[PDB]
Design a binder for this molecule. Structure first.
Ligand SMILES: [K+]
Ligand SMILES: [K+]
Ligand SMILES: [K+]
Ligand SMILES: [K+]
Ligand SMILES: [K+]
Ligand SMILES: [K+]
Ligand SMILES: [Mg+2]
Ligand SMILES: [Mg+2]
Ligand SMILES: [Mg+2]
Ligand SMILES: [Mg+2]
Ligand SMILES: [Mg+2]
Ligand SMILES: [Mg+2]
Ligand SMILES: [Mg+2]
Ligand SMILES: [Mg+2]
Ligand SMILES: [Mg+2]
Ligand SMILES: [Mg+2]
Ligand SMILES: [Mg+2]
Ligand SMILES: [Mg+2]
Ligand SMILES: [Mg+2]
Ligand SMILES: [Mg+2]
Ligand SMILES: [Mg+2]
Ligand SMILES: [Mg+2]
Ligand SMILES: [Mg+2]
Ligand SMILES: [Mg+2]
Ligand SMILES: [Mg+2]
Ligand SMILES: [Mg+2]
Ligand SMILES: [Mg+2]
Ligand SMILES: [Mg+2]
Ligand SMILES: [Mg+2]
Ligand SMILES: [Mg+2]
Ligand SMILES: [Mg+2]
Ligand SMILES: [Mg+2]
Lengths: 154, 237, 102, 53, 64, 123, 66, 49, 467
RNA sequence: GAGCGUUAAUCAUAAUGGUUUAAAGGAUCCGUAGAAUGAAUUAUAUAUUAUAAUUUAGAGUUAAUAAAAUUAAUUAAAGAAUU
RNA sequence: GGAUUAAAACUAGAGUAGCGAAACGGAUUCGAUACCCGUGUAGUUCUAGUAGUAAACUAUGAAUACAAUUAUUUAUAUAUAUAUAUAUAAAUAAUAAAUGAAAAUGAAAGUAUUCCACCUGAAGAGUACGUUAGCAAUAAUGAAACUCAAAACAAUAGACGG
RNA sequence: AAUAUGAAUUAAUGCGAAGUUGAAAUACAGUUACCGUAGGGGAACCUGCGGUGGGCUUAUAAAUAUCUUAAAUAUUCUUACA
């Protein structure tokens, strides 16, 4: 769901403004892939599976009995009195989805505004979804993949 | 109030003054602050345990952990509404510290109201010097009071001499009565023995109270008379 | 105040900053691009040492609030590559600068 | 990441779940039925004070 | 007033920060009760002796 | 507006100057015949005796044209050429007559800005 | 009092007890040691150290510290 | 990655250009008396007189 | 799919390495060592990592119970000598990388730190101990030698009764376990921090960064790391009393004082011919009992290495341990019992000591062969990003408690000064607690200085003489 | 500059917008179309869509237990005062 | 598209005490087609309908996810050394952050998402014409020409106030 | 029937200058203003009915207070005592 992803993007911005060290997001494949990309890129300190009440200390298998109570817990980073994850916005919106070929993704990473999408800025992360997998735009260009431009994180 | 930035970055703002040349001379604090960086995260931190009672914070009991029926005779097969509400706020709210001794302390002073009348000094001397062996109630350095009973009760339950808290508490209470009776006699006898050897005392406690009551009853006499004369005039109207 | 400058000529990336009623859209520019911005912003860039910059002002074009907004944007809306790298624990490479390196 | 997101209930787990859920519904129906009979008994004890003739 | 002037003047500051006090307004906060004279005088004394040791070490290096 | 409202027509209004000489019919100038020469009073705070003229254009539109320059020889039945441009202080006078065209002569003894007053160059 | 809490101090709180917040002394000690080293450094460097306290009774401590 | 090496050749691939050193070498073989000067790949257009 | 043996995580600008083998008490195998060795080379090249933190995920149960020698024993029984030599080349190469690492490494010794664990901390100037620390080198009971460069570290860092490596030989030959505060006072731990304060300390370590134009490899940053840890140090428990009394320190300093060609028999003679207090005499018998339940060959090899790696540079000392380990797994001359003893204790649970058979006295040539590289087996330590060697640790002294040789140097210097003044115990305490910048206010520094003066100095008039 | 000016026109010059109080929230709700938008897991396909199976966090149904006596429509009554 | 929709008004049949447009008188006033007083018709009431308009206002469309505190009630639940205490929601009040032209908003007028309605200088004008609906009053829909460089909001310091 | 043109005839409105008759609005604007609707009047406007605040949140006391060693002891204290 792009709506759920929009909710998570706004939630992370709200948490950064108040500078909470730990927060939770919905437990879904897309959310987990989204969070994992942020973790590998250094935007998130930690990524743990858990419940509504907090991160799990020991592995708890997820089943239909507890799926409704599952959450993903992420740790936010702050350095030099500044949040590492300052902004998080969707590019492809629920009511206007944007699919780009690899050629247009290369233009976006080169400073060209494609379909009103402002080009990639220094130190910014743009994520792309292709065949239900989320990857960095630079990685999609390396794999010659065409996909939906989901969001941009800075 | 907004998280301030300029108080913790004095070193970085100063460094720009020196590099540009706006400030010719390095301040004396400059080197000290550089070697000892200020903390500048100002984040809210989660907590997963109450330090007082060791209760775990942030743990959800899954339905798989409640296989048996409840007090109503029903099994739990699905999460309830409370289980489905995010509880992040509990991770950040300062835990309420609780102690079993607090319950006993309230009981002791409910059973012995006049123990409250014995003045207590809250000013600490040195908490780290307290070397107490609670096998006995009396201790060198601290008064005999309700706390002596509570600590004795805990030692009994900690050593497992008694199982029920009530039994340990009752045992400690009797030890407290014995010590209180020996002191009430030492004071009575000491006064009696001194008077028998020619000790003289200016004012007794009973006398002190009479004098203080006289001072108050004298002002009260004047006002009563004054207010019983204004009434007579005002009522005459 | 000191303002971060990328290669001591321009800003780090693009800035979309709102100062009261003034909407400032500033874009970094290539070497030799010059200053193509509101006249108020031009003077500030000259004193600050910014040589290449593009941008547009939207909504309110009050000179006083443009100047203050610009100064605030140059400090509160920029992040150096070094600061981004340290916060994220990653290496950030300027491809154009590496292309002309040994 | 390699862990599966969800593990489907085994056929046996679904059987035990259905047993508990059927029991829960049956117990509540029985308890309500017995409560109604206990109120009918307490009403019989006092029907000698009620007038119908 | 004093804290804001120190910020404007780039003067590092130390302060006792109680639960109702803003930590970010000082360079080096010390969390602690600021209402009791015993608590304040205990913390002030420690800082004062630390300064004294620094002063004695500076006067000692001058002698030798 | 929402994305669907924009799809249905919602959008920013367009900015384009509107015609201030509708009677000319998108022509640089139109010939006309003076119906009556008149003198009008500026709207406040201006004071003057502004010379104007009512003109019937070759397209049938009747307009009021300001006669620029010091002194004019325009009369009734005189052939005049009318161009765009309003007289700001005279409401309803939205056009100008061209000096030195038709039966309206150039300003007598004009030295500066002669081209604007139909004055030929002195030898 | 917990009623007067400035939530920006949340990370310094050990818990609440008897209607007041208990400050975490483990953090106080670490902050106190850090602050003390700064005072020692500035003193050893010859800097001017000003002690400001305007609550009743603080003068005696302030004068001796200086 | 924080410890990933990135050099001029890697940058050239990113920008889809020949390495800068190659450009310098190709610009030194342009002189009429310089080494490497070659022009024959174009002699493949049928002409009739 | 399986939990990785070692977990790597980012802590702001600090990189946390966590040992993740709880069921094995964080035992170090070739996989763990190789992973850590490779990841540390990358962090050395990185310009965003300021320091590294080596901890365990099992604290306070254990930090590292020692290298995985039970698996090396099975290799020997299966003649998989190539596998065994790989395990020691990886471990010893990782110990050499840590010793010469140019960025601060901070080891949290929160639990059992025995064997390989000692190699993970002994080579770092910032080795923090806790109440749960249990330092020991129990190799003599398994038939092995003191490895992981412990024959180069202990003779150079121990604080008391270590003038001639007497205390170093006592710990390596007896396998005595030192606990918490005692490890800090002996010099085994640079700092003593309560376990409860480790979380806060870790966060502060990630937040500190070199100032201005100083790299994390500069001495200036090393001082900053030391100060940060000190802010979390707390005063020792009031009841705490040092483990070894002066009388017990006199037995070790005399009974383990050998020459450049000493032998384990010489130590046995001193322990059997010791004279003095009743406690000292009884203490010497306790050591004699213990030293007679060890491997007769291991004790001689340990003494050889201590007398060889106490005056050599780090690289040659670590390399000599690789040769010894390889020359022991492959028992060409049937002079050791490392493999059989290891199975008797680890592979098979047997409280009783392994009955020893090699009870002879190896010659100087025999010891040389066991501790020298065989020309047929070429083994070399993996290359690190520093590739440097030196005879003295570059930072250990500045940030640990002073040794008995440093206090002596100041008494001799002060006593031989033109001032013509008298050295007084009070002046010694002040000079070590309130003078040296890196030692100012160091925990348990005055207590250690008083132990040294009461046992090493002679108080005549208002002066002190170095007996 | 052999053009210059002027008139007539075209493009550009702010929606990288707004609607408490400045132009602008429909009196309110119900609900049809929507070529509007919208959960979870897995597997395929021709792939942000389709299909199938599965799931319960949205949305509902029925009970049990406790709580409340209001809001509509209708019928039947009361009250102080006024003329 | 449908339904409901204050007051006034209208169509029938009842009712009509009090109140009360209008009208007729009395005062006040330079004058008083007013304010005040009298007599007081429609109306105000009920029954059955028509009509669908209000400063019909929170001048703020609905829904979902989310973000820092306090106080005060309410509800549910839990516990007991039985009346408090501990929890979780709702409401209200004051706020942090954020937003804003500011006044201020404060869980939205914040961070986001989805759908609908609506606006594009003033005046002309919610007017003209046409159409639709209604017994009617009217309601809905809804322009252009001409003219002008205005027009409007928040806030600031004054001046003034029967 | 539509489109266009003129058209008897007839409706609404803008601007321009000053005057005339009142003083309706802005302060409690001298009867609170305004919204819907109805009736009336030279003109603004007046009156009835309901609604709104873009007017009254502009909100600010029926007062009364207590006992333990006043000092040879607290008040002094400068890294000392322990
Ligand atoms: K607004
Ligand atoms: K009536
Ligand atoms: K709507
Ligand atoms: K009026
Ligand atoms: K009205
Ligand atoms: K009216
Ligand atoms: Mg306070
Ligand atoms: Mg030309
Ligand atoms: Mg445009
Ligand atoms: Mg809106
Ligand atoms: Mg509304
Ligand atoms: Mg409206
Ligand atoms: Mg439900
Ligand atoms: Mg009403
Ligand atoms: Mg009627
Ligand atoms: Mg009349
Ligand atoms: Mg009259
Ligand atoms: Mg009347
Ligand atoms: Mg109707
Ligand atoms: Mg109307
Ligand atoms: Mg309306
Ligand atoms: Mg209403
Ligand atoms: Mg609804
Ligand atoms: Mg109408
Ligand atoms: Mg206003
Ligand atoms: Mg009047
Ligand atoms: Mg008036
Ligand atoms: Mg009025
Ligand atoms: Mg009237
Ligand atoms: Mg009215
Ligand atoms: Mg008003
Ligand atoms: Mg008001």
């Amino acid at each position: 769901s792009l709506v759920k992803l929009a909710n998570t993007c706004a939630h992370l911005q709200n948490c950064s403004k108040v500078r909470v060290a730990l927060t939770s997001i919905p437990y879904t494949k897309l959310q987990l892939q989204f969070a994992y990309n942020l973790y590998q890129q250094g935007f998130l300190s930690s990524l743990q599976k858990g419940s509504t009440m907090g991160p799990d200390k020991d592995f708890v298998e997820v089943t239909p009995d507890n799926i409704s109570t599952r959450r993903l817990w992420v740790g936010l980073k702050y350095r030099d009195n500044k949040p590492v994850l300052s902004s998080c916005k969707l590019i492809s919106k629920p009511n206007s989805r944007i699919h780009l070929p690899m050629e247009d993704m290369k233009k976006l990473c080169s400073g060209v505004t494609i379909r009103n999408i402002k080009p990639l800025q220094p130190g910014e992360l743009i994520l792309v979804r292709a065949h239900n997998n989320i990857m960095d735009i630079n990685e999609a260009i390396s794999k010659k993949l065409d996909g939906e431009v989901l969001c941009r994180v800075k | 109030m907004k998280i301030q930035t300029n108080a913790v970055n004095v070193l970085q703002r100063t460094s720009a003054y020196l590099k540009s040349g706006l400030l010719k001379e390095t301040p004396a604090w400059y080197n000290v602050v550089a070697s000892i960086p200020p903390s500048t995260k100002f984040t809210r931190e989660p907590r997963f345990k109450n330090p007082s009672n060791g209760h775990i914070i942030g743990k959800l009991v899954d339905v798989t952990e409640q296989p048996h029926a409840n007090n109503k005779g029903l099994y739990k097969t699905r999460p309830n509404s409370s289980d489905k509400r995010v509880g992040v706020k509990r991770l950040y709210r300062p835990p309420k510290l609780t102690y079993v001794e607090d319950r006993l302390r309230s009981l002791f002073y409910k059973q012995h109201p006049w123990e409250l009348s014995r003045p207590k000094i809250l000013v600490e001397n040195e908490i780290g010097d307290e070397n107490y062996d609670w096998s006995h109630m009396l201790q060198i350095g601290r008064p005999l009071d309700g706390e002596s009973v509570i600590q004795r009760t805990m030692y009994l339950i900690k050593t497992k001499q008694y199982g029920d808290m009530v039994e340990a508490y009752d045992h400690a209470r009797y030890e407290f009565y014995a010590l209180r009776m020996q002191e009430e006699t030492e004071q009575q006898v000491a006064l009696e023995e001194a008077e028998m050897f020619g000790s003289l005392f200016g004012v007794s406690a009973i006398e002190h109270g009479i004098q203080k009551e006289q001072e108050v009853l004298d002002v009260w006499e004047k006002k009563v008379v004054e207010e019983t004369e204004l009434m007579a005039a005002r009522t005459s109207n | 105040k000191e303002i971060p400058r990328y290669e001591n000529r321009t800003i780090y990336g693009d800035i979309d900053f709102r100062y009261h009623g003034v909407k400032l859209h500033l874009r970094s520019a290539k070497p030799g691009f010059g200053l193509r911005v509101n006249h108020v912003i031009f003077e500030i860039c000259e004193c600050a040492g910014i040589k290449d910059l593009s941008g547009k002002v939207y909504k309110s074009r009050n000179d006083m609030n443009i100047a203050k907004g610009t100064i605030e944007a140059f400090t509160k809306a920029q992040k150096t590559l070094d600061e981004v790298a340290l916060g994220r624990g990653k290496k950030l490479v300027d491809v154009r600068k590496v292309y002309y390196s040994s | 990441m390699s862990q599966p997101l969800l593990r489907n209930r085994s056929p046996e787990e679904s059987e035990l779940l259905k047993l508990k859920r059927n029991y829960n519904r049956s117990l509540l129906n029985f308890q309500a039925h017995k409560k109604k009979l206990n109120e009918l008994l307490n009403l019989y004890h006092v029907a000698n004070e009620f007038i119908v003739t | 007033n004093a804290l804001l002037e120190a910020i404007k003047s780039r003067v590092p500051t130390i302060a006792i920060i109680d639960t109702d006090s803003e930590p970010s307004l000082v360079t080096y906060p010390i969390p602690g009760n600021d209402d009791s004279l015993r608590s304040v005088n205990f913390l002030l004394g420690v800082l004062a002796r630390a300064g004294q040791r620094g002063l004695q070490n500076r006067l000692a290096r001058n002698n030798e | 507006a929402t994305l669907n409202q924009i799809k249905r027509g919602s959008g920013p209004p367009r900015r384009k100057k509107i015609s201030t000489a509708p009677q000319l019919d998108q022509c640089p100038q139109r010939k006309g015949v003076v119906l009556r020469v008149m003198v009008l009073k500026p709207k406040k705070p201006n004071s003057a005796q502004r010379k104007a003229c009512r003109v019937r254009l070759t397209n049938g539109n009747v307009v009021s044209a300001y006669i620029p320059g010091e002194g004019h020889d325009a009369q009734e039945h005189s052939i005049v050429y009318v161009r765009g441009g309003r007289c700001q202080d005279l409401p309803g006078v939205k056009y100008h007559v061209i000096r030195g065209a038709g039966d309206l002569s150039g300003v007598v003894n004009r030295i500066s800005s002669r081209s604007k007053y139909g004055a030929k160059k002195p030898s | 009092s917990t009623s007067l809490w400035r939530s920006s101090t949340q990370s310094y709180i050990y818990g609440e007890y008897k209607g007041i917040h208990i400050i975490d002394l483990n953090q106080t000690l670490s902050y106190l040691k850090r602050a003390a080293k700064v005072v020692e450094g500035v003193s050893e460097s010859g800097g001017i150290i000003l002690f400001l306290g305007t609550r009743q009774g603080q003068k005696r401590g302030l004068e001796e510290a200086a | 990655a924080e410890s990933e090496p990135f050099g001029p050749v890697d940058a050239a691939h990113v920008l889809e250009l020949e390495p800068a050193v190659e450009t310098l070498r190709n610009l030194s073989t342009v002189g009429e008396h310089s080494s490497g000067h070659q022009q024959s790949t174009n002699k493949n257009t049928k002409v009739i007189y | 799919t399986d939990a990785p043996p070692v977990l790597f995580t980012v802590q702001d600008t600090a990189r946390v390495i966590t040992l993740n083998r709880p069921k094995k008490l964080n035992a170090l195998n070739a996989e763990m060592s190789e992973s850590m060795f490779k990841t540390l080379n990358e962090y050395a090249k990185s310009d965003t990592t300021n320091l590294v933190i080596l901890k365990s995920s099992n604290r306070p149960r254990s930090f590292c119970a020692g290298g995985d020698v039970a698996t090396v024993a099975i290799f020997n029984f299966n003649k998989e000598f190539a596998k065994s030599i790989k395990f020691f080349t990886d471990e010893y190469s990782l110990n050499f990388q840590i010793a010469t690492y140019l960025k601060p490494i901070v080891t949290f010794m929160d639990g059992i730190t025995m064997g390989g664990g000692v190699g993970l901390s002994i080579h770092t100037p910032f080795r923090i101990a806790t109440e749960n620390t249990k330092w020991a080198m129990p190799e003599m009971d398994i038939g092995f030698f003191p490895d992981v460069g412990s024959t180069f570290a202990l003779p150079r860092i121990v604080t008391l009764a270590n003038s001639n490596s007497q205390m170093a030989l006592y710990l390596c030959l007896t396998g005595e376990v030192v606990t918490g505060a005692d490890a800090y006072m002996l010099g085994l731990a640079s700092h003593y921090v309560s376990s409860e304060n480790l979380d806060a300390l870790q966060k502060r370590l990630g937040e500190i960064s070199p100032p201005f134009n100083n790299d994390p490899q500069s001495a200036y940053f090393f001082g900053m790391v030391n100060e940060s840890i000190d802010e979390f140090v707390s005063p020792l428990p009031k009841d705490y009393v040092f483990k070894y009394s002066n009388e017990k320190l006199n037995v070790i300093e005399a009974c383990f004082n050998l020459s450049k060609n000493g032998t384990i028999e010489d130590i046995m003679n001193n322990l059997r011919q010791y004279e003095g207090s009743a406690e000292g005499k009884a203490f010497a018998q306790e050591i004699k009992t213990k030293l007679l339940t060890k491997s007769p060959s291991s004790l001689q090899i340990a003494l050889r290495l201590v007398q060889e790696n106490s005056r050599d540079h780090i690289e040659s000392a670590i390399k000599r341990d690789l040769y010894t380990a390889a020359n022991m797994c492959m028992n060409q001359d049937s002079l050791v019992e490392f493999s059989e003893a290891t199975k008797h204790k680890l592979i098979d649970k047997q409280r009783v000591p392994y009955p020893w058979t090699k009870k002879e006295q190896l010659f100087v040539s025999q010891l040389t062969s066991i501790t020298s590289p065989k020309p047929s087996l070429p083994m070399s330590l993996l290359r690190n990003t520093s590739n440097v060697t030196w005879t003295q640790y570059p930072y250990h002294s500045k940030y640990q408690l002073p040794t008995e040789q440093e206090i002596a140097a100041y008494i001799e210097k002060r006593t031989n000064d033109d001032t013509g003044a008298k050295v007084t115990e009070r002046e010694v305490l002040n000079h070590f607690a309130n003078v040296i910048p890196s030692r100012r206010g160091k925990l348990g520094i005055q207590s250690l200085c008083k132990i040294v003066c009461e046992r090493k100095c002679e108080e005549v008039n208002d002066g002190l003489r170095w007996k």
